[PDB]
Nucleic acid binder design. Structure first.
Ligand SMILES: [Mg+2]
Ligand SMILES: [Zn+2]
Lengths: 717, 23, 687, 81, 62, 224, 226
DNA sequence: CATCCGTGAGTCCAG
């Protein structure tokens, strides 16, 4: 739903209302009915309420970066002249309320309304088509409000007390209807750990097996729990049939719940359940006691003690440079390191000095909003500011904003503050440009078939083999495997197949292969499957927005483009590296790769690096020429020790990156072929969005890259 | 006081004494 | 918009323009804050968008020398001793010398306290230097800022980003029916208002011989008399209400240079950009979520955030080929009910009430003698009504506008008034609007804390203090520590102590925290005004102390504690809020971004001449743009028909949009879209 | 098992999707029927041989889309691509 | 040539396309949007576009 | 575990009065006095000016010759006028004064059944040669009624509609002394604080509140 | 327009719909009506108990499945109506194998048990059970520490749920009367014991509050319109 | 592998 202004609606449904004005005979013809609307006669406000009945409208907010930039709503009339918006779609639109204006378009045709209600309605688009994570989820006050009541407080009043002496066990209530009356009188805290008998909530899976034998929990069956009253109220929203959760609601906790509701439970349950969460948050956010004063914001106690230790350490480096024993490149390189450490120790000074009661920490540690780096800037210190060049300034801002920055501190801070804003405005232009390029190249890419039926797929590292034994979950699991579909039966050591082919990978199914011991699965991909036009359905797999197999007809290429371009504002490799790969430029680094695998022959000179390679299988030696400014990349050797930098006598695979930098994809092609260059690009691209905390599923990248290799040159006519 | 020049309302000021020159 | 808005504009320094640089030519070096900007050009005052860094305000104390460079005052130090002798130094003339910061501690004679003091040097480099090498020192702490920037209390507690907006938004403040001076000030409010020239300042000393709302007459000493006429309810450049009112009562003794009458946003000769409201720092029922704002209905019921806006509407009568347009009260096929507010001429009568669509000036024009419809001929035979050859071209009221007609101006070529070639009668109608504050109206403070009005609760719904006083504005906690602008919090603290009044404990001597406090502030009355100059003013130790000295109310009870907080009661449920909430006063400005202006929509309307698409803007009553980025979002969803609908039958399908209207009013089905006329144009452009 | 769907959330979309191949398919499925019903009212006044009227009880001033979407839920319509 | 034209270097595309006498098959997203056709995606494809809805035989006028 | 009917005590002050009510249920006092507070501030009847008319004046935005204030600032001063009318139907007051000197609420003449409770209220400062002739209209009502509603009815181009604040209630609060002592001595004591505009008594205000509330709570007792 | 009263039903509980209230009287009515039902209605429950084979709490009763804790709780759920204000005492004795219920209870004259099928404790063979209950009257909810002084040869303090009302919530939406979309709509959820109907519990809760606002009205009975 | 010319360098709004 959304609050459409009565004034806006009248002109929007203008020919629709005139219709029902000559209908019920308020006006004699089509001409007069128009006058009635223009005069805003009292009759029409009863007519309009009828017209807009279940007739969806559209809300657009520029810049429209991803498709969720436009979401359809059920129109609700409202007094005032402003458009009333739901708090949960603030993430999708990226719409704060400091004076945003939203566009409104009225779908007309019978098809148009059908499209809007079904495809584009806010309640059906809860997930991010880019990642699959919930966008329509608790975000600011809502998360802070929920995080409140689900927090377990030790000594709080009304707490459970064991029996000892002449007084019985304090803290046990027969039912949730009892403890509610207890906090009303003022005996029980809503955050205090107690013991209660519940009759309308399914117990934990681990406990349900203990108290029923999984006989099937039923509404009416009672059970005892050790939670807080607030955690009970929370689980009534999930609601029934969902295993009770006994933690404090950090954003990551709540995110998990919704993402689990997204997988199993139907859309209209999630839609209504998430509605229940929002109302819960705001009510308690008001009664959370989160308030900013001069007191709560506290400067550290060892403020000047720590800063004097690192200023004394800094005067030793300035005197060691005064004697000219340190290089001018090393002085600043040493100075930056001293102060970076200083800022950290000031940060530690806050966390232990600040109560968990403290609101400023409460908001930050709970995933509500704001970083601790802000809180450090607020109470601790500003630290290093950026130079015009970009390098960090040798001089530090020791003051916090609570203490009042000096005249000269404010000046150098502002400079960096403005250059930050300037760069921000320029990357957006770049990103939005990069966006439109990815769109054009991937327009013909549509889901056309249900299955290509080719067995070609690509291998994905499920988990690394831990040195001591057992395994470690791979860092790239989420974005590379979790949404893929299997193109080959996954077998462990035994002949037993854990997961078939043509099976979508889900969370428990990755847990089926992770415990089985198998660390590599072959998965269907955009690259491999080959269809006449566009791509097939099966390879693409599970649509990140639906949590199910992609429908036939989705313009996945555009969504891919949008998925990549949407968060492209938050970069520092950086965004230039993003263009360098999709545009396939001969890189800046130009890191050399081995043309043939064999034993390495390092022969460094102080003036120049030279690398010679003795072919493993007979062959003639192939030798390269490298600049001393670049350095050898610590590649994972046969010794399974990646930190081993390139040494002579080492053994490299074919196409192995010799030095640090960026390999030339065109050389990767001629050396390692059309398929390997696809996996290089995709993961080189990924590494950039990784470092800045952006998770795009590999699926979207591959769509674009596929459209890079659809052509082969003509050697002989 | 801050600006006792024109005949203005007295706006008391936290300050170190500022007498270099008026704006 | 306001007097401050005007003043700053005149103190603008733009790099753009003929002989200067273009926007695209300007790299990143030009825009950032240069070291030499100290005391000359403000490092904070600059626009936010694509014009950042290329537009700056001139600093307060700087002046322009006969060659076109920017000088700035410095105090001269002969040999460690500060001298009152002042010399202006240009940018490069300052680089050869060595300057001390203004706040460096000085002996009562003029000597420095410590040998090594804070020093400014060429290339923005800073180091400690013995007192023997000090040449000059800064005039004032607030020397590097501009005029608007110097009106931001506790500026040294806010990050440059938000403080940049706070300054830029002050010029956006709307004049209110009557304006109150802020409880918390900086001292700049005075000198800013006077130099603005939209207040009234006496030229020569004397006595008020006579006073009216119309004008003030001053009887000088030498016997001569000067009379200042009051600007009363005049339309500005930006539809704001420039209204002036007398300060002095009849018979007052006034000396020269004294503000005898203030104008918009001015209280007793001080910049009055907003009101002093009772603030509460807490999330409340989600209505303040993401920087929105909650209001108390008192502010509507007492016109606290109400402003006046004048619009100037025009229409002329020209010589045509079919005759000439004549303004008359006789308009074809109009009832006398609609013409009831017109004079015998056809003009609206002064003081009348107009609504959107009504008639302001009745003008008719002779229409081209084209063969009238054979179907309308027939219709004119049955009812026997002979058609007139005059078509209605009257000035009606634009959509959105509404108010009272506060003045008519009429020029006629007949009465020898000089008009351009072709015009006979030209009428102007001034209509004002008394807009009370409503939902969606942009409210902001001096600290870059902006926000539109979320919800205005009934006065009883407002969380309130122990003595029953309901707050005015409910700001959301979450949106404070992120922006680093906790100056808004310090303002609230000092804002409460200024409202409550205080008294430092003199028994057992003067307290050590209030040791640096000037004598005049140890004792303050309720509703007292105070200054907190930038890079000076109150410190955190004193502000904490003052919260302890908080004088009790009428009932003898203190309301807030030393933490600055207090206990509230939820007016809805009744139960007291469980935790102490920070309460005080904050100066809030009404910006010029009101829903009455910003709201706009359209079903059908005018269209472009070539592309046949809808026109653009509210002023043209045009449709929104569904551009390239919006089209991707549609294409992404897989909403083929919606997207097709928007660009065809909703845009420039000449026969289509027409055949969509009918289908709707006939209650039928929407037909299949045709060919976009825009495409045909492209094809004829290629040919 | 859920709470009673209010307004435009009814009929619930999950049960609506159980009878159709995909999200997009349901759109043309319903709209073309919503088109048929609106033809029926307009035609009936002057033209016989209209498409068959709504197979369920019409809500008071119910939208033809809202009508069609309900009978889809009632499995009273046949599906062809 | 249409999709290419409305992308970049507009004048370069046209000079080549005119000499090459390239005939554009209007079967793409950028293509169809410009001419105002239903985009060949989602609800636009013939699989979903050509659908016949009829009442069940069991369903009958009362 | 005790039964006692409640009381309604009173400790006074000329303008404001404290009402003491006890003994009430434990944890009840806060939501009881608030139910009263929200009744006083919003729905207590009174009388106030709705429209006015000034000689030589045709709208709100101009100046009367020889008068120090503008019509807006004058109409703004009249918002603090305290009036109590008994006539359920509109009545017309008057004010005519000339020459030098100050005009106040005292120079207003209420007809039969209308009374001014604050004659010392400054209105306009008429200097020499100045004349002011006003014609004030007072109505009965409750709460707050915006001026804008009068204009459309049919009012002539002379009348200038003015906002109305009917509520004669100034400031309301309450405090509670809950004896939370571990015994059957747990009760809540209520101390209501009511301040008026000298248009009505603080007591008379609490009475109308109760009268309203009683007739509202009576529908929960009626049977189906 | 005058206000109405609606009802949406279930056996033990129901929802009441009040609209349209004058703008801002939804929250003026809400919390005030809830605390009344919860605290201002008299009933009867259990004040204190006494067990035969108990000298301290941690040990369960010899021959009983449930802990001393789980029995107190089940007894808290016992709905009882007493005719006399003065505290009465009922005995419950049972031995051997089986299950003890609320129908096995021996109630005094003028004292009734309303749910005789309530599970309380499961006894095994050679399992003896002798318990003394103390039944009082009152309103609302009273803590256990306030009832710490039964015979000190095993007196146990129990939470006293006198109130025949179990749990009440309320929501305030806005209905659109005339042109005004300001009027308030009050929705009230009320769940009671098996002693009194929710429909009845509200009328007495209604009548009670009428008594309170009478004190103010008595002075002058000035004006109002319905 | 480095130069010279031509073509790019986010959206909506207001005005
Ligand atoms: Mg925004
Ligand atoms: Zn395939």
């Amino acid at each position: 739903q959304c609050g459409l202004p009565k004034l806006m609606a009248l002109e929007l449904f203008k020919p629709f209302v005139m219709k029902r004005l000559v209908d019920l005979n308020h006006a004699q013809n089509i001409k007069s009915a128009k006058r009635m609307v223009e005069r805003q006669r009292p009759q029409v406000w009863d007519v309009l309420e009828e017209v807009i009945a279940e007739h969806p409208v559209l809300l657009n907010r520029a810049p429209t970066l991803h498709r969720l930039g436009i979401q359809a709503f059920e129109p609700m009339l409202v007094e005032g002249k402003a458009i009333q918006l739901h708090p949960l779609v603030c993430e999708a639109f990226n719409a704060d309320f400091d004076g945003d204006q939203m566009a409104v378009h009225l779908p007309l045709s019978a098809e148009a309304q059908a499209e809007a209600r079904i495809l584009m309605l806010s309640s059906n688009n809860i997930l991010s088509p880019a990642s699959g994570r919930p966008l329509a989820m608790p975000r600011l006050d809502m998360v802070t409000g929920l995080y409140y009541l689900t927090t377990e407080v030790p000594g709080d009043t009304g707490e459970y007390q064991p029996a000892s002496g002449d007084h019985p066990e304090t803290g046990v209530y027969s039912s949730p209807a009892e403890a509610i009356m207890a906090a009303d009188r003022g005996v029980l805290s809503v955050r205090a750990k107690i013991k209660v008998r519940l009759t309308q909530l399914r117990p934990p899976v681990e406990i349900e097996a203990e108290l029923f034998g999984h006989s099937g929990w039923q509404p009416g069956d009672a059970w005892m729990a050790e939670t807080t009253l607030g955690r009970v109220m929370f689980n009534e929203l999930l609601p029934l049939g969902y295993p009770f959760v006994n933690k404090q609601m950090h954003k990551k906790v709540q995110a998990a719940i919704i993402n689990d509701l997204a997988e199993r439970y139907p859309m209209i349950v999630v839609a209504q359940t998430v509605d229940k969460l929002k109302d819960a948050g705001f009510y308690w956010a008001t009664r959370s006691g989160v308030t900013v004063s001069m007191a709560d914001v506290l400067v550290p106690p060892r403020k000047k003690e720590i800063l004097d230790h690192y200023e004394e350490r800094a005067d030793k480096v300035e005197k060691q440079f005064q004697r000219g024993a340190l290089n001018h490149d090393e002085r600043n390189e040493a100075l930056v390191e001293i102060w970076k450490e200083a800022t950290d120790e000031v940060g530690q000074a806050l966390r232990e000095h600040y109560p968990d009661d403290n609101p400023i920490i409460t908001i930050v540690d709970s995933g509500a909003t704001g970083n601790f780096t802000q809180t450090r800037t607020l109470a601790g210190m500003k630290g290093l500011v950026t130079n015009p060049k970009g390098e960090f300034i040798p001089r530090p801002v020791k003051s916090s904003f609570r203490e009042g920055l000096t005249v000269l501190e404010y000046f150098i801070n502002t400079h960096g503050a403005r250059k930050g804003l300037a760069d921000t405005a320029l990357r957006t232009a770049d990103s939005g440009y990069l966006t439109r390029r990815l769109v054009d190249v991937s327009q013909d890419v549509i889901v056309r078939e249900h299955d290509c039926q080719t067995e070609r797929g690509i291998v994905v590292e499920l988990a690394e083999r831990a040195p001591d034994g057992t395994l470690i979950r791979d860092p790239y699991i989420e974005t590379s495997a979790y949404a893929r579909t299997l193109g080959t039966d996954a077998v462990d050591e035994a002949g037993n197949v854990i997961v078939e082919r043509g099976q979508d990978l889900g969370d428990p199914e990755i847990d089926a292969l992770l415990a089985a011991g198998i660390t590599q699965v072959k998965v269907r991909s955009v690259l491999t499957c080959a269809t006449s036009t566009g791509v097939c359905a099966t390879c693409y797999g599970r649509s990140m927005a639906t949590g199910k197999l992609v429908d036939i007809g989705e313009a996945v290429g555009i969504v891919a483009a949008q998925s990549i371009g949407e968060p492209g504002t938050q970069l520092t490799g950086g965004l230039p590296r993003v263009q360098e790969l999709f545009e396939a430029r001969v890189p800046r680094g130009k890191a050399p790769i081995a043309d043939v695998t064999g034993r390495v022959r390092l022969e460094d000179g102080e003036r120049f690096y030279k690398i010679t390679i003795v072919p493993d299988d007979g062959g003639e030696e192939v030798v390269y020429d490298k600049i001393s400014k670049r350095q050898r990349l610590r590649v994972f050797k046969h010794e399974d020790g990646s930190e081993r930098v390139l040494s002579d006598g080492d053994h490299v695979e074919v196409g192995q990156q010799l030095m640090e930098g960026s390999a030339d994809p065109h050389e990767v092609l001629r050396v390692q072929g059309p398929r390997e260059v696809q996996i290089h690009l995709v993961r080189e691209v990924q590494e950039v969005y990784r470092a800045q905390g952006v998770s795009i599923h590999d699926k979207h990248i591959e769509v674009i890259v596929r459209q890079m290799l659809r052509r082969v040159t003509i050697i002989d006519s | 006081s801050n600006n006792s020049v024109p005949g203005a309302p007295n706006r008391v000021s936290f300050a170190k004494l500022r007498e270099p020159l008026e704006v | 918009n306001n007097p401050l808005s005007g003043l700053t504009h005149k103190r603008r320094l733009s790099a753009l323009g003929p002989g200067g640089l273009s926007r695209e030519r300007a790299g990143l070096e030009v825009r950032d804050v240069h070291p030499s900007h100290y005391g000359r050009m403000c490092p904070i005052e600059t626009p936010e968008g694509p014009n950042i860094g290329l537009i700056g305000s001139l600093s307060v104390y700087a002046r322009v020398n006969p060659f076109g460079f920017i000088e700035t005052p410095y105090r001269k130090v002969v040999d460690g001793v500060v001298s009152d002798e002042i010399v202006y130094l240009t940018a490069d003339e300052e680089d050869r010398h060595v300057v001390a910061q203004a706040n460096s501690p000085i002996d009562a004679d003029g000597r420095f306290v410590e040998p090594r003091v804070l020093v400014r040097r060429k290339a923005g480099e800073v180091e400690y230097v013995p007192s023997s090498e000090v040449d000059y020192m800064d005039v004032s702490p607030r020397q590097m800022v501009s005029v608007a920037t110097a009106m931001i209390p506790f500026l040294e507690h806010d990050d440059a980003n938000r403080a940049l907006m706070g300054a830029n938004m002050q010029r956006q403040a709307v004049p209110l029916v009557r304006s109150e001076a802020p409880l918390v000030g900086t001292g700049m409010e005075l000198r800013a208002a006077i130099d603005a020239g939209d207040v009234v300042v006496a030229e020569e000393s004397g006595v008020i011989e006579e006073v009216s709302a119309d004008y003030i007459t001053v009887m000088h000493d030498n016997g001569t008399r000067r009379t200042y006429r009051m600007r009363k309810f005049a339309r500005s450049n930006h539809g704001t209400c420039a209204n002036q009112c007398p300060i002095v009562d009849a018979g007052d003794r006034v000396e020269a240079g004294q503000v005898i009458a203030d104008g918009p946003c001015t209280d007793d000769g001080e910049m009055a950009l907003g009101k002093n409201l009772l603030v509460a720092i807490m999330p409340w029922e989600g209505h303040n979520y993401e920087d929105a704002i909650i209001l108390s209905n008192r502010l509507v019921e007492e016109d606290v955030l109400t402003s006046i806006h004048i619009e100037e509407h025009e229409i002329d009568a020209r010589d045509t080929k079919l005759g000439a347009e004549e303004i008359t009260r006789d308009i074809p096929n109009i009832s006398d009910e609609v013409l009831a507010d017109l004079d015998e001429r056809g003009i609206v009568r002064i003081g009348a009430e107009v609504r959107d669509g009504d008639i302001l000036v009745g003008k008719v024009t002779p229409k081209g003698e084209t063969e009238l419809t054979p179907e309308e001929r027939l219709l004119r035979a049955i009812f026997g009504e002979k058609a007139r050859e005059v078509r209605d071209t009257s000035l009606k009221v634009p959509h959105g506008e509404s108010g009272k007609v506060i003045g008519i101006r009429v020029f006629s070529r007949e009465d020898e008034d000089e008009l351009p070639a072709g015009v006979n009668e030209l009428v102007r109608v001034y209509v004002a609007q008394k807009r009370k504050i409503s939902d969606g109206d942009k409210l902001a403070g001096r600290h870059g804390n902006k926000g539109v009005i979320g919800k205005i609760l009934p006065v009883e719904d407002m969380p309130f203090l122990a003595d029953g006083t309901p707050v005015d504005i409910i700001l959301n906690t979450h949106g404070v520590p992120r922006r680093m602008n906790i100056g808004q919090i310090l303002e609230t603290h000092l804002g409460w102590c200024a409202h409550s009044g205080w008294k430092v404990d003199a028994a057992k001597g003067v307290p050590d925290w209030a040791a640096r406090l000037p004598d005049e502030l140890l004792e303050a009355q309720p509703n007292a005004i105070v200054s907190t100059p930038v890079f000076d003013g109150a410190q955190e130790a004193e502000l904490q102390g003052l919260l302890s000295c908080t004088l009790p109310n009428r009932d003898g009870d203190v309301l807030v504690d030393a933490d600055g907080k207090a206990m509230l009661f939820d007016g809805r449920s009744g139960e007291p809020f469980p935790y102490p909430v920070t309460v005080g006063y904050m100066y809030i400005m009404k910006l010029h971004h009101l829903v009455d202006d910003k709201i706009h929509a359209r079903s059908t309307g005018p269209y472009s001449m070539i592309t046949q698409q809808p026109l653009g803007g509210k002023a043209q009553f045009g449709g929104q743009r569904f551009g390239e980025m919006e089209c991707w979002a549609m294409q992404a969803y897989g909403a083929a028909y919606t997207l097709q609908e928007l660009l065809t039958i909703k845009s420039d399908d000449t026969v289509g949009r027409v055949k969509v209207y009918e289908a709707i009013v006939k209650g039928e089905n929407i037909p299949e879209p045709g060919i976009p006329e825009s495409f045909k144009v492209l094809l004829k452009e290629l040919q | 098992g859920y709470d009673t769907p209010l307004g435009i959330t009814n009929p619930p979309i999950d049960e609506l999707l159980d009878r159709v191949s995909s999200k997009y398919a349901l759109v043309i499925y319903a709209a073309k029927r919503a088109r048929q019903i609106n033809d029926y009212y307009n035609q009936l006044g002057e033209g016989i041989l209209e498409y068959v009227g709504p197979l369920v009880e019409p809500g008071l001033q119910e939208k033809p889309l809202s009508i069609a979407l309900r009978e889809i839920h009632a499995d009273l319509l046949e599906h062809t691509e | 040539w249409l999709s290419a034209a409305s992308f970049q270097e507009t004048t370069r595309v046209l000079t080549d396309a005119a000499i090459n006498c390239r005939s554009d098959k209007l079967n793409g997203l950028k293509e169809n949007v410009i001419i105002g056709k239903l985009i060949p995606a989602g609800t636009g494809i013939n699989r979903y576009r050509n659908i016949a809805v009829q009442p069940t035989e069991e369903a009958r006028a009362a | 575990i005790s039964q006692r009917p409640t009381l309604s005590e009173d400790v006074l002050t000329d303008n404001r009065s404290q009402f003491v009510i006890e003994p009430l249920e434990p944890g009840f006092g806060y939501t009881l006095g608030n139910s009263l507070r929200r009744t006083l501030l919003s729905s207590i009847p009174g009388a106030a000016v709705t429209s006015i008319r000034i000689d030589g004046v045709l709208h709100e935005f101009t100046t009367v010759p020889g008068v120090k204030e503008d019509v807006t600032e004058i109409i703004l001063n009249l918002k603090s006028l305290v009036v109590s009318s008994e006539e359920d139907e509109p009545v017309t007051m008057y004010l005519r004064k000339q020459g030098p000197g100050e005009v106040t609420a005292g120079d207003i003449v209420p007809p039969a059944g209308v009374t001014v409770h604050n004659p010392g209220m400054h209105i306009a400062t008429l200097n020499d040669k100045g004349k002011l002739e006003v014609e004030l209209v007072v109505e009965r009502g409750r709460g707050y009624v915006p001026a804008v509603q009068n204009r459309a009815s049919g009012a002539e181009i002379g009348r200038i509609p003015v906002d109305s604040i009917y509520s004669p209630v100034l400031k309301v609060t309450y405090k509670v002394d809950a004896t939370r002592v571990e015994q059957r001595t747990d009760f809540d004591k209520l101390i209501l604080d009511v301040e008026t505009k000298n248009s009505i008594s603080p007591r008379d205000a609490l009475a109308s509140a109760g009268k309203t509330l009683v007739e509202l709570f009576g529908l929960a007792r009626e049977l189906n």
